[PDB]
Amino acid sequence: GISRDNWHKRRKTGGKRKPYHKKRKYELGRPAANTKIGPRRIHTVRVRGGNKKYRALRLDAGNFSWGSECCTRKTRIIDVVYNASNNELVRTKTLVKNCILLVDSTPFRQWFEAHNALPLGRKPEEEEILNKKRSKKTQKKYEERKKTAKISPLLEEQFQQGKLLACIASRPGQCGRADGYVLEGKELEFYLRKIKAK
Amino acid sequence: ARGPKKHLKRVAAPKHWMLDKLTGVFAPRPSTGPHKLRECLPLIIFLRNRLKYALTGDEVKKICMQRFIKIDGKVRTDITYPAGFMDVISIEKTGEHFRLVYDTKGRFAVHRITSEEAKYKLCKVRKTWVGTKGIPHLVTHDARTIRYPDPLIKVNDTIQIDLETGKITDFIKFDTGNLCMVTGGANLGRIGVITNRERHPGSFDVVHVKDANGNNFATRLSNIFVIGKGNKPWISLPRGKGIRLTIAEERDKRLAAK
Amino acid sequence: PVARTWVCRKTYVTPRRPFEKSRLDQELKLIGEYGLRNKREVWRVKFTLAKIRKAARDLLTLDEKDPKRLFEGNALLRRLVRIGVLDEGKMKLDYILGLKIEDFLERRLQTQVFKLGLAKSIHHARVLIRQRHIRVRKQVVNIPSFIVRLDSQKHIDFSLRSPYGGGRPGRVKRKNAKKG
RNA sequence: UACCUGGUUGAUCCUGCCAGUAGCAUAUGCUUGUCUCAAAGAUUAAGCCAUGCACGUGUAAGUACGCACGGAGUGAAACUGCGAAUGGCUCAUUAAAUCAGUUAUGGUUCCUUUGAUCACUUGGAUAACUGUGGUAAUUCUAGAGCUAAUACAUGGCAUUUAUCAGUGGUGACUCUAGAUAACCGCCGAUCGCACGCACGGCGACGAUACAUUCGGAUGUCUGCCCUAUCAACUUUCGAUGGUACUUUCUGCGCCUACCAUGGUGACCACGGGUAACGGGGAAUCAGGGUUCGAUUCCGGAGAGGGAGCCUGAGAAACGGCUACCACAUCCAAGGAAGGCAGCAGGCGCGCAAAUUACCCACUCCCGACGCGGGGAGGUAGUGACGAAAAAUAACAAUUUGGAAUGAGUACACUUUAAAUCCUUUAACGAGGAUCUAUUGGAGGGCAAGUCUGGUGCCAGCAGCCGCGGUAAUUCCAGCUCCAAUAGCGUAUAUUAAAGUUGCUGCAGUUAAAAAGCUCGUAGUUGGAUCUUGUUUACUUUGAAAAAAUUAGAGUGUUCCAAGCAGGCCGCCUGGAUACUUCAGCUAGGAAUAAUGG
RNA sequence: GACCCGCCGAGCAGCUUCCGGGAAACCAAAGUCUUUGGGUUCCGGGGGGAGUAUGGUUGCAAAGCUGAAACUUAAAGGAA
RNA sequence: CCCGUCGCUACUACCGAUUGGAUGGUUUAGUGAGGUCCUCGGAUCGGCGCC
């Protein structure tokens, strides 16, 4: 099958090398995962040494983290928007490492309101609890949080659309998980300019 | 070539085993264990070739299977157990206790010890790591993992454990002025006082050892096994501790004893 | 893979000039003088001494106080004075080069049992040894090329089972006795 | 032992080769009494294979309702577990590849061993077994009836990212730990013994985020023969580098996408050849070398040719599968089964290479294991590959005599798993001691006949020069002599000889030879000078360089080649040392030769 | 300036010598060479086959440059 | 003493029409068994129409 050896290439000088042995098993290669967006389908691959690799064939949810704050919630992957490798994987919606995609921005806003007591993606009985009644000693705790609860202008306009720019830091084809971090700061301004031109 | 090798030729056997040629084609391959293949003495060779307690490999198995032999206090029934350096071979049936220590020729000599001894053994620390929940661990030269060691014990010192409990009783720090037995070839079995340690970053640290008679010689840090604090060894040394008489001096001592 | 050695060695060297009359008469002079079988035994003793002189040549080129010359030099001298070839008065490597082929031929077993009066001739000696009559300190030695050393020279005698020694006479004497 | 001799001429001194000479290793010829060892279908065919065998495995401790044997137990069979990835064989491929030294994984995976760490006694299937069957045929299997589990299934860490701080570290962590936000296997339904006080001891088995061992995998530095009638090569479709993945046990154009246009080479790239596996080594050698290394040790590779996989810790496995290719077997013609470069054996190929033997007793290996298995191995048979020891007479009288013995032979012992052999030893066994030593030579080189008979430039001899044309010292023979000797010739390759391949160390006026001449890059080599009275090269020291082989210490294997054992009247001694180029590492020297301020 | 008498450097040569070398003829270099090493390029390996075959390259051509093997031979040759 | 042509016999390579022939190795472009992976497929049978 697929071989990851280095004796099938040429030499540094440019000359070809003749193989002295056939293809070995410790230098094999396996087909790509091609992790699409959809219901969770994982295939465990027994690898060298009796270990197991989890090859994600399609994933819809991912454990993404927020950089500025400390909020790591399992959100839903919506759609990919940019890829540094090639524009063909975003056309097929393939989940790979360092792939910019839109994630469900509900858990990140739900935590922001339940912790800082301030509307984030606002332009219902659940929002009535946001203005909860409690002791004044507890209210003073949430009052000092609002003095440092100001979010970046580039992120507040993304909570309105319910979609946050994220970046996959894991390897779906190796561990079967599409975890990552929320794209923000200077990294966001870079990819927003790339998607805008594209 | 497809996996692990399970045989060992007599010509490829370690030289310090002192195996002949015309007895057989294969040599006893020591099973996996605390000590390396090239740096051990399998139990079949020690009972048959050294102690002459058995004449064939089958007679060796008749002794080990009766649970008469204890390496470091624990009974071993495998006739190919490594049983390397500093290991205690106690035989309660004959009331004999041994401790494998090299001689001036670099070979495991028959070193009989006392019943007051054979309860402890010296071990050289090779790796120190911090396990889970902030628990420091230890790696001796015979694959003995020790939890909660003294914080002063480092990656080259020598500890003293008790064969009944496996707990560290005492330890000897590695510094200039302590005894050591070289265990790395061309000085294997020589005992002297450490005098200088050359530190080579990214390479092997070369130390300089001086015998009791004044003979100086250098070796590598991985071959040093601290024996005692100062010049008093914490173990019983065999005849000819580490002097390594020259070929001219060994001839004189040979014919003078006639 | 077998439990064998295959470690052999030739104990002689054929001379370069095959038909030189100066050497052919010299070697034959040593065969008749010491009762040898052929020229190979002459070339054998010649090859042993040629290896001893080469060992002394390698040591004499070294320094006088070289540890290899002092150790292997005394070991070479001890083995020469042990077999009676070299004298105890000459314990220096310079006298090894002065040795000759006859010094080693005089130390062979058939030469000793002839000088000790056990045999009437040097050719009677080889047949006397090959017929299991000569013993060395309670060991029946059957090889005429048995190089006798000093401590084994005073113990050469007839075997305890020889008709010449204290033993039953041979089959010829026993058959000629039962006739008459 | 740092060695030469014949041959060109009428003669001479030369150049020079031919031939002689001595090892070696294959074949072969003749001959061959004993004994210690011992190579042995590699060379041409990695050609093809009848048949037999070479991998199997059970403890008090996974599963025992086969009376199969039995007062529970002992067991077939079978399930489960493990091994079958080692060994053995071959040298086809392969020329910076393999391999060797060095070394890196802080870029990794590792069954096992070792030390750490750790009740609702549940559910329903199945083999053996019972029974019914099919096919010409297979170690083919179908259907039904049962019944077990250490089989199957049920009943805070680890795993994946993000943030913060800086317990033990290293020359150097994005290290080991810790604290947060989350994300989403492991935490014992097992077995034996001992039986004591609801609690209890000793084990077996089993878990791995760990260590450890056996080691894999891929890198670092340096090192390979011949070839220029191979001078430029690589780069579509990766060549070189960058970025992000994907993939793998991980690093890496390993792969993909987007960019960059690189990378290599007269210091010989690329291409071609190798009757090329590499090395440890072997032969031959004053020094220097030349040649060899299929071949018992290490590493690699392959199992007719490729390719693709299963299982497993480990295989791109072939005494495992699935294809195609080559070849070939049984058929009832529907189908089925094949891989000897495993041990013997057979065919073929050839100049060229052995028994279809015996045992697991030794050496070790595997397995549940003290108990089983092993064409691994050992043993014997064949064996003038080769190496060691060593008979074929000795003595005395004058041709004649008594002595002495091994060959041979056996009552037996010993030897060994059982034997054989050797050794030990009764009996017996030598005068033509017929118990018969041959193999090549007798012109020279080259040790040995002006001998006799025959042949008559014939037949033949002759490595070379030559001999033979009727008295041949050379041929065919008798006699005699010489050389080595249980060995001695022949053919071929190879080494010394060859200072006739040259570094040591040759030659080029006329013997073979200096370009017609000059310029010129690389290459090679370069004045003197700096303390006398940074970068390297070099030298010295230490570590390393696996054993076996070689050198060599000790030791009466009867001696010896060998072996590593063996002394002493339990007892004390060995199982040394030296060498291992080059590169790399280390510590001194600072002349010589470069380089820098 | 011409000539005469010397010296120095450069060069074409000559001769006498037992400098030494060489197989010798001969050579002040063809010496300093078994007492063998200043530096460096090209080049020879018995005589034939043969500067032939083939391949490449150069040229309008003639030919130049590079350049074998099978096979054959015990001499070919130098100086005297 | 000796050279060459010619003639005779033998041997060895050389040139040579024959789109000569036979193997081996690199490959361009087609066809492509077999396994693996992925996307589907759901013959079947176990539990409670769904799993």
From Swiss-Prot, chain B:
Pfam families, per database record: 40S_S4_C, KOW, Ribosomal_S4e, RS4NT
Keyword list, A-Z: Cytoplasm, Ribonucleoprotein, Ribosomal protein, RNA-binding, rRNA-binding
Family assignment from sequence similarity: Belongs to the eukaryotic ribosomal protein eS4 family.
Cross-referenced HAMAP family: Ribosomal_eS4
GO molecular function: RNA binding; rRNA binding; structural constituent of ribosome
Domain S4 RNA-binding, chain residue ranges per copy: 41-103
Subcellular location: Cytoplasm
GO terms under cellular component: cytosolic small ribosomal subunit
GO terms under biological process: translation
Cross-referenced PANTHER family: 30S/40S RIBOSOMAL PROTEIN S4, SMALL RIBOSOMAL SUBUNIT PROTEIN ES4
Known partners and oligomeric status: Component of the small ribosomal subunit.
CDD domains on file: KOW_RPS4, S4
Function: Component of the small ribosomal subunit. The ribosome is a large ribonucleoprotein complex responsible for the synthesis of proteins in the cell.
Protein name: Small ribosomal subunit protein eS4
InterPro entries found in the cross-reference section: KOW (IPR005824), Rib_uL2_dom2 (IPR014722), Ribosomal_eS4 (IPR000876), Ribosomal_eS4_C (IPR032277), Ribosomal_eS4_central_region (IPR013845), Ribosomal_eS4_central_sf (IPR038237), Ribosomal_eS4_KOW (IPR041982), Ribosomal_eS4_N (IPR013843)
